[PDB]
DNA sequence: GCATCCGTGAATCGAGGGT
DNA sequence: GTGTCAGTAGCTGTCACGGATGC
RNA sequence: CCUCGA
């Protein structure tokens, strides 16, 4: 929700996620970078990490 | 010869063209929109002289419009007259320096008529400072001059719109009448063939609701428009039928919530559209329905309102449109076409200037007077009351203070050399109130109208967001007391061309049918060839008889702007380069000396004089003493004049207005004749750059694809140096634990850093003053409950902060001047602020490595290499170029005109004998005798659309004059053979070579470089802050992130939005671990993220992190 | 390091639960003494001290009272940052 | 729709008066759209991201 | 689509009643902050005001419900009160907005996470940097496809700590705050240190608009004269830069493993061939390919 | 008059900490350089505000002794500090 | 059951100046 | 303490598109 | 938000 919420129409995704209770997995280039994270990718991955 | 008038130099012009009209002061859509509005003489003269008969000035027409001034009841009366001026409250100079208002105490004469007692008393009320427009069209507000632009603002009237159905796919067809002032109606045919019509924007009723509230009965109804089958469907699906029962239905939906009295509906619904006071269609907005109807097209124009048979005429003009019919007359109306109109037509599209637009603004403080008046009449006594008690100016002097404070119109005057500060006097600007808005501007708006030939011009125009928004005033073009653009016509009487002007509309435009300017004319006026150009009403272009050309235009030149005149051979440089030519003259940088370019086009005198940075005498005599400082005229009859040189100021872009006497002492000079002219003019002409020797090469990748390699010769010599001027401030305040003082005992500074500084803390007048560098000394006390335990630690091992006005990064010059302000001193600041101190620092701009050039052709380039003199390729005869120009970046962007001018600058700088021998040669037959013989550094003129043909250009360059040594350096080809400076080899081809008109650009990168390690952060988001001047950081935006994803750095990415942007203990970390040399700590989370979480909970939204155990972490 | 982050419907009682203090007050600040106005929209007692460690009354204005109850003023002295993260609240009638 | 008359004139041989002015049209909506068709493009772009 | 609601309140646990509020929240005092200006007055939020119209109407309430207030003052207040509350979340969401001073609609809470200005979009996905800079772009035929030339002006605020940590190694400077008083007031013998700093440091160059991974290159600083970045022309196809005035920012690696994704991943010279279509771009363009 | 909100009005900053982090990066090389009695009194005295009966209450040490250490120790400080330069 | 009307979206960075 | 009429400015010169809202 | 630069 995290992820949509920046995308388009920020009112009516944020609405649908608390009525949902959504939980956000952080694991997302766009939510990483939102809170600071390493993105899942390129040298983000497990693998290289 | 050209522009003969003044006295100016005489320079040529290739003209084949006469000109019937020369250009009118380009100044004048200011000035006489500003004397309309206070009446001057010299209006008023031209209004009596026009054949108008009673005109209004500006003030006079508010104040008739108000009074009188009456209660409900009628005993008392007051009313207003006759408005004067005092003499000016301070110079112009003077308001510039002290930070107050150019402005002149405006007088009224008011009278109280007392109807229960027969007795008035009238007297002189004082109503405020009234801001004056200097002679070159600006306002002085706070110091900083001002330019009101003219808005373009739909015209009041009728207009008809024929809409297209989405999914019915049917023609519909809608109505709005436009008063100048309150309330609007709009009628429309839905897509159920009924008609009705929305009142103020409110819920659309049947167009019958309006009938039977005005007393139509639904029979005499039926009796007009039963001719349409959706007028009768209208009043059949109507809902309540009656006279007084519509009229409360209008009442409910237009004011609801009140009780519906039969009389408190039937006062408003005829003072919302026939009293004067809530509603009034202007002297213009009458006129131009009484067109569109065809009613009272013979009455003189002295209905202000609108009336209930204009409203029937309207509703049949839009049925019959409806169904097809092409013609309708009015019962007791002449014929008329039906038909829809364009809305952007410059005839329904009106311009409003200075005066119009101000008088709004004094009519809005004059109604809050109003009413205040009227309740101020009914408290006091009606015996001890007069003109001074009832009065209240404070929502009046609000008014311009709000409008020349805040509005889009009262825009920062364009100061960066004279031709852009006379293009901003004469913008035409479609944003703003009443207009409309950015987002509310379709394509259509701002797109080239068939309408704006002669009006306003198609080429200069931003090519930013705000493209075909705002345009300039075409060069003959002026505006009527009705607000629409006149442009000047020769009358054709019978295939003759006459020099009888006449100025038409642009309605009045589409009635005749006109000529081309560059239309073959007889010596005595009979065209040479039948068919001619000849341009027809809805923007229609084709050839026609002669017998049939009722009017021509004036000059070839009259449907550009004053900088599009100003580009050489215009006709060969498409619109897109062009409009880059003529918006970055506006951006030329004044320089240290100034030279007149040798291929001119005519406009540059004109412009420069109507201008106003230039100084011309007033009226003729001799010079009696001249200096640096001033020059004083003595007249033929006895008295003196002196005009006193503006030396070294600053202009509202930091560029240098520095004006020099041109003539001598014991000078005769006539009237009107330039004796000094100012930044970018020489002998009077426009002077915006420099004549370059060019030469059109590429050079060894240093001028790649528009780059420009220039000769250290134009840096030797200071050809391309500019002043540049800026402004530091400084106050000292009174503060909470006491006062800020400046002096020069600063605490822990050495006496080497002040040695510069008076014993005030002051840098003195001629320092050199790096950046860091202190100005002034202010120190501001701190409390003690402010300091770290570090700097109270470091305080107990060994109260005021350093605040000192230092030099910011990037800035460098001499100190030319202090101005310093001190309350102690009589001198008046602001609440709390005890002492203010300016400084002004001067750098001389040497031509660098990334400065901007430009010609007149959107031909811009940066420089990408200043090589030494010897490293030019030099022509035959050992002179060095100055300039390289990259080749491939010529031909694709199609402005021929820099070759043409290119070459006709090297004719122009060697000189030209024709052979006269065995007659004039062919080719030199139209050319003007004037011409034959040129010698080396001769000005000329390419008249725009005229001048300069390529056939006489290449005759030109066949005899061009040969050098000292009598060689002829180029060929006739134009190009000439140069060598390598580097090398020695001459280079293997010819080149073409000639001198061309070089502008330097304010865009220099001493002003545009920055960088930034760590500085101040916004408070808020805890982000490094923005901008230069606020030492901020660059945006890594959302595509930049998208790269750094894109090639998977995600540790870069972090790094960018952790360590190094609001990570609050990260960033500190890796400033630390830098001075210390270990590595780079771990990144945090970013205190905007932070901020995040508690925006989502402020609306209760519950946000948890939670672990991957389950338990919200705190 | 923190898995997944849960939204959801903020229970009234978790608005409360948030708040440091009703906003009972419709006042703002002083315009002469920058001081906040008590239970105003900027109450110290609720969101926090202006400056760090410093109270409203003025009897602890040094960093020796880290934890003090201001009992004249009703002031937390901790550092000005809570003032980013101390939410307040309205009970509606 | 094209114009039932033509630009017969070459930038080398000199516009007249009213070709200039009739070149406006197309050239003014050439820059404007193109301000239009970089805006939808822009746009797109970040939808496929 | 009924059910897609209730459904979520059945399985989820939460009640439906938290759609109707019996208190809302305050935002803490950072977030709206009051500012002062310069002539004495003051401007603030228009949270504030939006919060301050609230509180207001909520004490009124108070006053009514105690005053025992007829039946209508009472219920047309708390409707007052709903048109309150909507405008702080959501101002202009229902009806026309709450208006300002001048007809200016107000903010509201929901109007800082929308659209480009938003949270969001403004200051999550993109945030403004440190250690950055821009300058005008000039074309330099003789550097390296690797090579970059940055002004020293740049390069000295660019690198300030790490100039001010190798002179106070080298005893140029008696300590680290006497080094940064050098670079401040420019002396010198920063000139020649520098140099040691910006060895192999590779920076990142970027010009906007920012369309492809292209637009994004890394380069081997080199200490030049003159205030104008210069720039390889054979990488100004990927930018798509031309020099008529273009304008490029660059950024500093700090981390160890930055500068690794500058050197190895963004470096100029491993990223000749387009992504798009695996034809070259770094190649003979324009003067060049006319030479040949 | 204003909203922050509203364009025209500058909006807040606060400046960088380099030269509060170099001070301490100085303060705590010179602060190493003492003596645990020493060290421990001025972190008590500056970074924890305490007043002197305070120090000498927790330490279990006399009133003049806490007055005759911080008196050193701040000597002590001074002379490591012109050693290397640091600015009066 | 369907036409209307409501709400959502509309490129990136950068300079300077007013209130 | 208040007591005869005592009544916004501004504005529509954006548009494509989907689906809940509503006759 | 006014003007402007790629």
């Given at each position: 929700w995290?992820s949509?919420?920046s995308?388009?129409?920020?009112?009516?995704?944020?609405?649908?996620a608390?009525?949902?209770?959504?939980?956000?997995?952080?694991?997302?280039?766009k939510?990483?970078?939102?809170?600071?994270?390493?993105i899942?990718?390129?040298?983000?991955?497990?693998?290289?990490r | 010869?050209?522009?003969?008038?003044?006295?100016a130099?005489n320079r040529?012009?290739?003209?084949?063209?006469?000109?019937p009209?020369?250009?009118?002061g380009?100044?004048?859509?200011q000035?006489?929109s500003?004397?309309?509005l206070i009446?001057?003489?010299?209006?008023?003269?031209?209004?009596?002289?026009?054949?108008?008969?009673?005109?209004?000035?500006?003030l006079e027409?508010?104040?008739?419009e108000?009074?009188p001034?009456?209660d409900?009841?009628?005993?008392?009366?007051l009313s207003?007259?006759?408005?004067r001026?005092?003499?000016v409250?301070a110079?112009?100079?003077?308001?510039?320096?002290?930070?107050?208002?150019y402005?002149?105490p405006?007088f009224?004469?008011?009278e109280?008529?007392?109807?229960?007692?027969?007795?008035i008393?009238?007297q002189?009320?004082?109503?405020?400072?009234?801001?004056?427009?200097?002679?070159?069209?600006?306002?002085?507000?706070?110091?900083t001059?001002?330019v009101?632009?003219?808005?373009?603002?739909?015209s009041?009237?009728?207009?008809?719109?024929?809409?297209?159905d989405?999914?019915?796919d049917?023609?519909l067809?809608?109505?709005?009448?436009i008063?100048s002032?309150?309330?609007?109606?709009?009628?429309?045919?839905d897509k159920?063939?009924?008609?009705?019509?929305?009142?103020?924007?409110?819920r659309?009723?049947?167009?019958?609701?309006?009938?039977?509230?005005?007393g139509?009965?639904?029979?005499?109804?039926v009796?007009?428009?039963?001719?349409?089958?959706?007028?009768?469907?209208?009043?059949?699906?109507?809902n309540?039928?009656?006279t007084?029962?519509?009229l409360?239905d209008?009442?409910?939906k237009?004011?609801?919530?009140?009780?519906?009295?039969?009389?408190?509906?039937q006062?408003?619904?005829?003072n919302?559209?026939?009293k004067?006071?809530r509603?009034?269609?202007?002297?213009?907005g009458?006129?131009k329905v009484?067109?569109?109807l065809?009613?009272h097209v013979?009455?003189p124009?002295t209905?202000?309102?609108?009336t209930?048979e204009?409203?029937?005429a309207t509703?049949?003009?839009?049925?019959?449109?409806?169904?097809?019919?092409?013609?309708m007359?009015?019962?007791?109306?002449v014929?008329?076409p039906?038909?829809t109109?364009?809305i952007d037509h410059?005839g329904?599209?009106?311009?409003?200037?200075?005066g119009?637009?101000?008088?709004?603004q004094?009519?809005?403080?004059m109604?809050?007077?109003?009413?205040?008046?009227?309740?101020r009449?009914?408290?006091?006594?009606?015996?001890?009351?007069?003109?001074?008690?009832?009065?209240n100016?404070?929502?009046?002097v609000?008014?311009i203070?709000?409008?020349?404070?805040?509005?889009?119109?009262?825009?920062?005057?364009?100061?960066?050399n004279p031709?852009?500060?006379?293009?901003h006097?004469?913008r035409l600007?479609?944003?703003?109130?009443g207009?409309?808005?950015?987002?509310?501007?379709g394509?259509?708006?701002?797109?080239?109208?068939?309408?704006?030939?002669?009006?306003?011009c198609?080429?200069?125009?931003?090519?930013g967001?705000?493209?075909?928004?705002?345009?300039?005033?075409?060069?003959?073009?002026?505006?009527?007391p009705?607000?629409?653009?006149?442009?000047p016509?020769r009358?054709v009487?019978?295939?003759?061309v006459?020099?009888e002007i006449?100025?038409?509309?642009?309605?009045?435009?589409?009635?005749?049918?006109?000529?081309?300017?560059?239309?073959?004319?007889?010596?005595?006026?009979?065209?040479?060839?039948?068919?001619?150009?000849?341009?027809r009403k809805?923007?229609?272009?084709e050839?026609?008889p002669?017998?049939?050309?009722?009017?021509?235009?004036?000059?070839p030149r009259?449907?550009?702007?004053?900088?599009?005149?100003?580009?050489?051979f215009?006709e060969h440089?498409?619109?897109?380069?062009?409009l880059m030519?003529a918006?970055?003259?506006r951006?030329?940088?004044p320089?240290?000396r100034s030279?007149?370019?040798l291929?001119?086009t005519?406009?540059?005198?004109?412009?420069?004089?109507?201008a106003?940075?230039?100084?011309?005498?007033?009226?003729?005599?001799?010079?009696?003493?001249?200096?640096?400082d001033?020059?004083?005229?003595?007249?033929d009859?006895?008295?003196?004049?002196?005009?006193?040189?503006?030396?070294?100021?600053?202009?509202?872009?930091?560029t240098?207005?520095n004006?020099?006497?041109?003539?001598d002492?014991?000078?005769?000079?006539?009237?009107?004749?330039?004796?000094?002219?100012?930044?970018?003019?020489?002998?009077?002409?426009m002077?915006?750059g420099?004549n370059?020797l060019?030469?059109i090469?590429?050079?060894?990748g240093?001028?790649?694809e528009?780059?420009?390699?220039?000769?250290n010769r134009?840096?030797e010599?200071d050809?391309?140096?500019?002043?540049?001027?800026?402004?530091?401030?400084?106050?000292?305040?009174?503060?909470?634990?006491?006062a800020?003082?400046?002096?020069?005992?600063?605490?822990?500074?050495?006496?080497?850093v002040?040695?510069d500084?008076?014993?005030?803390?002051?840098?003195?007048?001629?320092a050199?003053?790096?950046?860091?560098?202190?100005l002034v000394?202010?120190?501001?006390?701190?409390?003690?409950?402010?300091?770290?335990?570090?700097?109270?630690?470091?305080?107990?091992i060994?109260?005021?902060?350093?605040?000192?006005?230092?030099?910011?990064?990037?800035?460098?010059?001499?100190?030319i001047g202090?101005?310093?302000?001190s309350?102690?001193?009589?001198?008046?600041?602001?609440?709390?602020?005890?002492?203010?101190?300016?400084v002004y620092?001067?750098?001389?701009?040497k031509?660098?490595?990334?400065?901007?050039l430009?010609?007149?052709?959107?031909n811009?380039?940066?420089?990408?290499?200043?090589?030494?003199?010897?490293?030019?390729?030099?022509l035959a005869?050992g002179?060095?170029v100055?300039?390289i120009?990259?080749?491939?970046?010529?031909?694709?962007?199609?402005?021929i005109?820099?070759?043409l001018?290119?070459?006709?600058?090297?004719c122009?700088?060697?000189?030209?004998?024709?052979d006269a021998?065995?007659?004039v040669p062919?080719?030199?037959?139209?050319?003007?005798?004037?011409?034959?013989?040129?010698?080396?550094?001769?000005?000329?003129?390419?008249?725009?659309?005229?001048?300069?043909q390529?056939?006489?250009?290449?005759?030109?360059?066949?005899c061009?004059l040969?050098?000292?040594?009598?060689?002829?350096?180029?060929?006739?080809?134009?190009k000439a053979?140069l060598?390598?400076?580097?090398?020695?080899?001459?280079?293997?081809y010819?080149?073409?070579?000639?001198?061309?008109?070089?502008?330097?650009?304010?865009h220099?990168?001493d002003?545009?470089?920055?960088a930034?390690?760590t500085?101040?952060?916004?408070?808020i988001?805890?982000?490094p802050?923005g901008?230069?001047?606020?030492?901020?950081?660059?945006?890594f935006?959302?595509?930049e992130?998208?790269?750094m994803?894109?090639?998977?750095?995600?540790?870069?990415?972090?790094?960018?939005?952790?360590?190094k942007?609001?990570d609050?203990?990260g960033?500190?970390?890796?400033?630390?671990?830098?001075?210390?040399?270990?590595?780079?700590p771990?990144?945090?989370?970013?205190?905007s993220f932070?901020?995040?979480?508690?925006e989502?909970?402020?609306?209760?939204?519950?946000?948890?992190?939670?672990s991957?155990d389950?338990?919200?972490?705190? | 390091?923190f898995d997944?982050?849960?939204?959801?419907?903020?229970?009234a009682?978790?608005?409360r639960?948030?708040?440091?203090?009703?906003?009972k007050?419709?006042?703002?600040?002083?315009?002469?003494?920058?001081?906040?106005?008590?239970?105003?929209?900027?109450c110290?007692?609720?969101?926090?001290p202006t400056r760090?460690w410093?109270?409203?009354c003025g009897?602890?204005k040094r960093?020796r009272?880290?934890?003090?109850?201001?009992?004249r003023?009703?002031?937390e002295?901790?550092?000005?940052?809570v003032?980013?993260?101390?939410?307040?609240?309205?009970?509606?009638? | 729709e094209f114009?039932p008359?033509?630009?017969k004139?070459?930038?080398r041989?000199?516009l007249?008066?009213?070709?200039?002015?009739?070149?406006?049209?197309?050239?003014?909506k050439?820059?404007?759209?193109?301000?239009?068709?970089?805006?939808?493009?822009?746009?797109?772009?970040?939808?496929?991201? | 689509?009924?059910?897609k609601?209730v459904?979520?309140?059945q399985?989820?646990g939460?009640s439906?009643?938290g759609?109707?509020?019996?208190?809302?929240?305050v935002?803490?005092?950072?977030?709206?902050?009051?500012?002062?200006?310069?002539?004495?007055?003051?401007?603030?939020s228009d949270?504030?005001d939006?919060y301050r119209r609230?509180?207001?109407?909520?004490?009124?309430?108070?006053?009514?419900?105690?005053?025992?207030?007829?039946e209508?003052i009472?219920?047309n207040?708390?409707?007052?009160?709903?048109?309150?509350?909507?405008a702080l979340?959501?101002?202009?969401?229902?009806?026309?907005?709450?208006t300002?001073?001048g007809?200016?609609?107000?903010?509201?809470?929901?109007?800082?996470?929308?659209?480009?200005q938003?949270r969001?979009?403004?200051?999550?996905?993109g945030?403004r940097?440190?250690?950055?800079?821009?300058?005008?772009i000039?074309?330099g035929?003789?550097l390296?496809?690797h090579?970059?030339?940055?002004?020293?002006?740049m390069a000295?605020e660019?690198?300030?700590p790490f100039?001010?940590?190798?002179?106070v190694?080298?005893?140029?400077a008696?300590?680290?705050?006497?080094?940064?008083?050098?670079?401040?007031?420019?002396?010198?013998?920063?000139?020649?240190?520098?140099?040691?700093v910006?060895?192999e440091?590779?920076?990142?160059?970027?010009?906007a608009?920012?369309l492809?991974?292209?637009?994004?290159?890394?380069?081997?600083?080199?200490?030049?004269e003159?205030?104008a970045?210069?720039?390889?022309?054979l990488?100004?196809?990927?930018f798509?830069?031309?020099?008529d005035?273009?304008?490029?920012?660059?950024?500093?690696?700090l981390s160890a493993?930055?500068?690794?994704?500058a050197?190895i991943?963004?470096?100029?010279?491993?990223?000749?061939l387009?992504?798009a279509?695996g034809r070259p771009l770094?190649?003979?363009?324009?003067?060049?390919?006319?030479?040949? | 008059?204003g909203?922050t909100?509203?364009?025209?009005?500058?909006?807040?900053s606060?400046p960088?900490?380099?030269?509060?982090?170099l001070?301490?990066?100085?303060?705590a090389?010179?602060?190493?350089?003492?003596?645990?009695?020493?060290?421990?009194?001025?972190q008590?005295?500056?970074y924890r505000?305490?007043?002197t009966?305070?120090?000498?209450?927790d330490?279990?040490?006399?009133?003049?002794t806490?007055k005759?250490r911080?008196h050193?120790?701040?000597?002590?400080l001074?002379?490591?500090?012109?050693?290397?330069g640091?600015?009066?």
């Open positions: 995290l949509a919420a995308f388009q129409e920020t009112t009516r995704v944020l609405t649908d608390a009525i949902n209770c959504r939980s956000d997995k952080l694991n997302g280039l939510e990483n970078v939102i809170i600071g994270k390493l899942p990718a390129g040298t983000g991955i497990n693998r290289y | 010869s050209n522009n003969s008038v003044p006295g130099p040529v012009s290739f003209a084949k063209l006469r000109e009209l020369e250009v009118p380009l100044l004048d859509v000035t006489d500003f004397e309309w009446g001057s003489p010299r209006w008023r003269e031209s209004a009596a002289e026009r054949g108008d008969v009673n005109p209004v000035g500006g027409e508010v104040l008739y108000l009074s001034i009456e409900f009841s009628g005993s008392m009366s207003f007259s006759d408005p001026f005092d003499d409250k110079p112009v100079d003077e308001c510039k320096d002290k930070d107050m208002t402005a002149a405006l009224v004469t008011a109280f008529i007392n109807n229960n007692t027969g007795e008393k009238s002189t009320v004082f109503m405020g400072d009234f801001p004056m427009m200097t002679e070159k069209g600006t306002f002085i507000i706070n110091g001059e001002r009101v632009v003219s808005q373009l603002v739909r009041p009237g009728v207009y008809f719109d024929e809409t297209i989405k999914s019915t049917k023609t067809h809608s109505v709005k009448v008063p002032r309150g309330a609007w109606l709009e009628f429309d045919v159920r063939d009924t008609v009705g019509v929305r009142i103020d924007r409110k659309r009723q049947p167009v019958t609701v309006l009938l039977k509230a005005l139509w009965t639904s029979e005499q109804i009796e007009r428009f039963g001719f349409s089958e959706i007028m009768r469907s209208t009043l059949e699906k109507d309540t039928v009656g007084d029962e519509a409360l209008i009442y409910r237009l004011r609801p919530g009140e009780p519906p009295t039969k009389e408190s509906a006062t408003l619904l005829e919302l559209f026939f004067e006071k509603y009034d269609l202007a002297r213009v009458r006129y009484n067109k569109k065809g009613l013979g009455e124009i209905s202000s309102t609108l209930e204009d409203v029937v509703i049949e003009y839009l049925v019959r449109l409806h169904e097809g019919q092409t013609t007359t009015v019962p007791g109306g014929e008329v039906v038909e109109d364009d410059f329904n599209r009106r311009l409003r200037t200075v119009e637009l101000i008088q709004n004094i009519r809005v403080g109604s809050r007077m109003e009413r205040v008046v009227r309740e009449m009914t408290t006091q006594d009606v015996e001890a009351i007069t003109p001074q008690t009832l009065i100016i404070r929502p009046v609000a008014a203070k709000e409008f020349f404070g805040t509005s889009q119109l009262s825009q920062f005057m364009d100061q960066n031709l852009s500060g006379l293009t006097k004469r600007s479609a944003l703003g109130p207009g409309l808005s950015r987002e509310r501007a394509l259509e708006v701002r797109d080239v109208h068939p309408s704006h030939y002669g009006r306003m198609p080429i200069e125009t931003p090519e967001p705000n493209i075909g928004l705002i345009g300039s005033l075409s060069v003959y073009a002026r505006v009527n009705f607000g629409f653009i006149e442009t016509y009358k009487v019978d295939g003759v006459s020099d006449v100025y038409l509309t642009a309605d009045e435009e589409d009635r005749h049918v006109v000529a081309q300017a560059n239309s073959p004319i007889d010596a005595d006026g009979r065209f040479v060839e039948p068919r001619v150009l000849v341009r809805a923007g229609e272009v050839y026609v002669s017998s049939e050309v009722d009017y021509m235009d004036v000059s009259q449907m550009v702007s004053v900088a599009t005149a100003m580009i050489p215009l440089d498409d619109a897109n380069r062009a030519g918006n970055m003259q951006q030329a940088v320089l240290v030279e007149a370019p291929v001119g005519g406009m540059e005198l004109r412009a420069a004089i109507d106003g940075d230039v100084v011309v005498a007033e009226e003729s005599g001799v010079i009696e003493e001249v200096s640096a001033y020059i004083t005229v003595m007249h009859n006895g008295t003196r004049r002196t005009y006193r040189m503006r030396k070294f100021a600053r202009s509202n872009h930091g240098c207005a004006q020099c006497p041109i003539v002492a014991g000078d005769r000079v006539e009237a009107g004749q330039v004796i000094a002219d100012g930044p970018c003019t020489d002998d009077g002409e002077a915006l420099k370059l060019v030469a090469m590429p050079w060894e240093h001028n790649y528009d780059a420009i390699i220039l000769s134009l840096v010599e050809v391309l140096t500019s002043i540049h001027i800026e402004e530091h401030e400084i106050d000292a305040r009174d503060t909470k634990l006491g800020e003082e400046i002096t020069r005992d600063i605490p822990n500074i050495s006496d080497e002040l040695a500084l008076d014993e005030r803390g002051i840098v003195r007048i001629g050199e003053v790096r950046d860091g560098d202190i000394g202010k120190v501001t006390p701190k409390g003690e409950t402010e300091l770290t335990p570090e700097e109270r630690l470091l305080r107990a060994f109260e005021v902060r350093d605040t000192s006005l230092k030099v910011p990064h990037g800035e460098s010059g001499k100190v202090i101005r310093v302000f309350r102690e001193d009589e001198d008046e600041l602001p609440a709390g602020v005890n002492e203010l101190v300016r620092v001067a750098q001389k701009r031509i660098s490595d990334g400065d901007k430009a010609g007149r052709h959107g811009k380039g940066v420089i990408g290499k200043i090589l030494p003199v010897e490293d030019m390729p030099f005869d002179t060095p100055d300039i120009l990259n080749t491939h970046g010529v031909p694709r962007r199609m402005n005109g820099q070759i001018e290119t070459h006709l600058g090297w122009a700088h060697s000189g030209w004998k024709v021998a065995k007659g062919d080719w030199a037959a139209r050319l003007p005798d004037e011409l034959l013989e040129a010698q080396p550094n001769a000005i000329v003129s390419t008249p725009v659309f005229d001048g300069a390529e056939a006489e250009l290449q005759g030109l360059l066949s061009t040969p050098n000292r040594d009598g060689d002829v350096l180029v060929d006739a080809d134009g053979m060598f390598d400076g580097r090398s020695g080899e001459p280079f293997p010819p080149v073409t070579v000639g001198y061309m008109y070089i502008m330097k650009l304010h220099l990168v002003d545009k470089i920055h930034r390690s500085g101040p952060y916004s408070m988001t805890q982000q802050l901008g230069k001047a606020q030492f901020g950081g660059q945006r935006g959302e595509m992130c998208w790269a994803q894109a090639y998977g750095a995600a540790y870069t990415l972090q790094e960018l939005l952790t360590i942007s609001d609050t203990v960033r500190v970390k890796v400033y630390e671990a830098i001075v210390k040399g270990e590595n780079i771990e990144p945090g989370i970013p205190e932070k901020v995040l979480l508690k989502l909970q402020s609306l209760c939204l519950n946000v948890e992190v939670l991957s389950g338990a919200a972490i705190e | 390091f997944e982050l849960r939204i959801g419907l903020a229970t009682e978790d608005i639960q948030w708040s440091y203090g009703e906003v007050k419709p006042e703002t600040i002083n315009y002469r003494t920058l001081k906040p106005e008590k239970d105003g929209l900027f110290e007692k609720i969101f926090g760090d410093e109270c409203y009897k602890y960093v009272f880290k934890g003090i109850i201001c009992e003023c009703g002031v002295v901790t550092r000005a940052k003032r980013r993260e101390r939410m307040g609240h309205i009970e509606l009638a | 114009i008359r033509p630009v004139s070459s930038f041989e000199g007249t008066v009213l070709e200039y002015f009739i070149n406006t049209h197309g050239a003014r050439g820059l404007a759209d193109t301000a239009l068709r970089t805006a939808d493009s822009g746009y797109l772009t970040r939808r496929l991201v | 689509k009924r059910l609601v459904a979520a309140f399985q989820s939460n439906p009643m759609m109707v509020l019996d208190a809302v929240p935002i803490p005092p950072e977030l709206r902050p009051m500012v002062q200006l310069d002539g004495g007055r003051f401007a603030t949270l504030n939006l609230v509180i207001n109407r909520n004490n009124r309430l108070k006053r009514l419900i105690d005053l025992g207030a007829p209508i009472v219920n207040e708390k409707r007052m009160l709903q048109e309150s509350v909507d979340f959501d101002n202009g969401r229902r009806g026309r907005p709450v300002g001073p007809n200016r609609p107000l903010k509201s809470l929901s109007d800082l996470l929308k659209g480009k938003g969001f979009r403004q200051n999550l996905l945030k940097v440190d250690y950055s800079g821009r300058s005008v000039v074309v035929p003789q390296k496809l090579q970059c030339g940055l002004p020293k002006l000295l660019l690198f300030k100039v001010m940590k190798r002179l190694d080298l005893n140029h008696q300590n680290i705050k006497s080094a940064k008083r050098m670079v401040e007031r420019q002396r010198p013998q920063v000139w020649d240190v520098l140099e040691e910006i060895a440091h590779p920076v990142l160059l970027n010009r608009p920012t492809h991974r292209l637009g994004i290159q890394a380069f081997e600083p080199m200490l030049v003159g205030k970045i210069q720039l390889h022309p990488v100004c196809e990927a798509n830069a031309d020099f005035g273009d304008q490029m920012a660059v950024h500093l690696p493993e930055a500068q690794a994704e050197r991943l963004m470096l100029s010279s491993n990223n000749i387009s992504p279509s770094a190649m003979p363009r324009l003067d060049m390919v006319t030479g040949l | 008059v909203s909100d509203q364009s025209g009005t500058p909006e807040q606060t960088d900490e380099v030269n509060a982090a001070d301490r990066l100085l303060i090389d010179a602060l190493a350089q003492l003596s645990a009695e020493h060290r421990a009194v001025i008590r005295s500056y505000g305490w007043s009966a305070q120090i000498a209450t330490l279990g040490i006399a009133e003049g806490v005759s911080l050193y120790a701040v000597r002590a001074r002379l490591t500090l012109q050693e290397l640091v600015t009066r």
